[PDB]
Structure formats: structure tokens, C-alpha cells
Design a protein around this ligand. Sequence first.
Ligand code: K7J
Length: 224
Amino acid sequence: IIDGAPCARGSHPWQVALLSGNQLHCGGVLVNERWVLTAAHCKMNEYTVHLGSDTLGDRRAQRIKASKSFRHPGYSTQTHVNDLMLVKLNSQARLSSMVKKVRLPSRCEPPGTTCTVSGWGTTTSPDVTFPSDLMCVDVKLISPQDCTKVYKDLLENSMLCAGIPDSKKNACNGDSGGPLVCRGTLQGLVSWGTFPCGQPNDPGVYTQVCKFTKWINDTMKKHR
Ligand SMILES: *C[C@@](*)(O)[C@H](Cc1ccccc1)NC(=O)[C@@H]1CCCN1C(=O)[C@H](C)NC(=O)[C@H](C)NC(=O)CCC(=O)O
């Protein structure tokens, strides 16, 4: 997260981190006791899931191994369209005041809506600086017509843009799969942006979750 600040303590109980061993790979969100929702470009053979603490690497944080993951069938490693994936935990997560299921959307929030994106991604770019505390930044949803002016052919229908005019506030490497919450529901998952990160007027791009609830629900039902 670029130009942000530590998220409010305990305000993101559904935020998880996908680790490679004990090293940050991507962010993610807890859907239920057995599933984490994240970005498809974060695909790995297996993962270690961090839950229950705003401090990445917290010795007292819950840790669960995940061996199975399933990317949306329409995902492209080329364009990153449909950049979402479901990761199945090997054992069910222990829910508590600090580990909760995220609230999935029933509708899409309109352009201009103020939202919050979080993650343990780098706070600087290209030079990397990884925070120990979960970082947050508020951004506003940008209409597709307005975002297309910037990204043109890079933009696809199920991608959602968000940012603040003339501001560096944005997501960066390590934040993928992370939550973009607007007025109580998960509206996006961090997907991509420009490099270096934080270039003013270059919106952050997210997978628009309100377009995928059917797939998310059916996929979980499928793997029991
Ligand atoms: C995987 C996830 O952690 C990460 C999060 C992120 C979000 C915003 C900026 C940087 C990183 N997402 C990615 O890494 C995605 C998927 C891999 C490629 N990717 C990118 O965001 C890459 C770095 N962006 C680009 O390639 C963009 C389209 N190009 C440019 O920025 C170069 C052209 C220009 O600068 O205009």
C-alpha cells in the first residue's frame, strides 16, 4: 500500500496473507472456515495462510496450510482478466473476534463510492519496503468510461478501478488478492496497476467481486 497508514486494530478480521513458507506472497480474504478468496496471479503449488493478526509474522497468529487452489476458468496469465482464485484450507480456520468471514456483496457499488483497500504489500516503489502492520488507504471507485481513458485495451469488463485524483495512494506488489471494501461489503480484490507504483492518476485495478458471486458460491459448493 502506497501513501497509506496502519489499518485500525482489529478492523480487518477477514484479511489473510498467503505466504510462501513464511514469506509474504499475496493478500487474501476469508470467505468461510475452509476458503480464502484471492487473486489468480497469486497461484502457487501450496500456501501457508496467516490469519488473526494485523501484524504479519505475529508469532501468535493462526497459520494454516493450503494445498488446493482454483483459479476462475476465464483467468488469463496474459491480460489478468478474471483475476480471482479460491484457496481451500487443509483444516478449518478458527473463527473469533479477530478471524471473521468477509461480507460478500449482493450489488455493485457505484462510481465515486469511497472505499478502503488494505495489505502488507510494499509501501515504496520501485525500492521495496515491507511493513509489519497491515496498511490501509481510502480510494474512490472510478467509472469504466473514465478508467478506459487511462488503460484503454488493458481494461476488461469485470475489472474495477479506484484511486484518488493526483494522488499516490494505491496498492502495490504484495497487496494482490487483498480486500477493497466499500460501505460494508467486499467490492474488489487487488489485481494490478502501473509500475512503479503510486503514479498519480494511474488507478489501481481490482477484480470486481459483484460480478463473481455466482462462481464463488458454486465453486465452494463443488469442492463440497
Ligand atoms: C500480484 C499482486 O500482488 C500485484 C499487486 C500490484 C498492484 C498494483 C501495482 C503493482 C502490483 N499485481 C501484479 O503484480 C499484476 C499481475 C502481475 C503484473 N501486475 C502488475 O500490476 C504489473 C506490474 N503492471 C503492469 O504490467 C502495467 C500494466 N504496466 C506498467 O505499469 C508499465 C507501463 C506504464 O508504466 O504505463
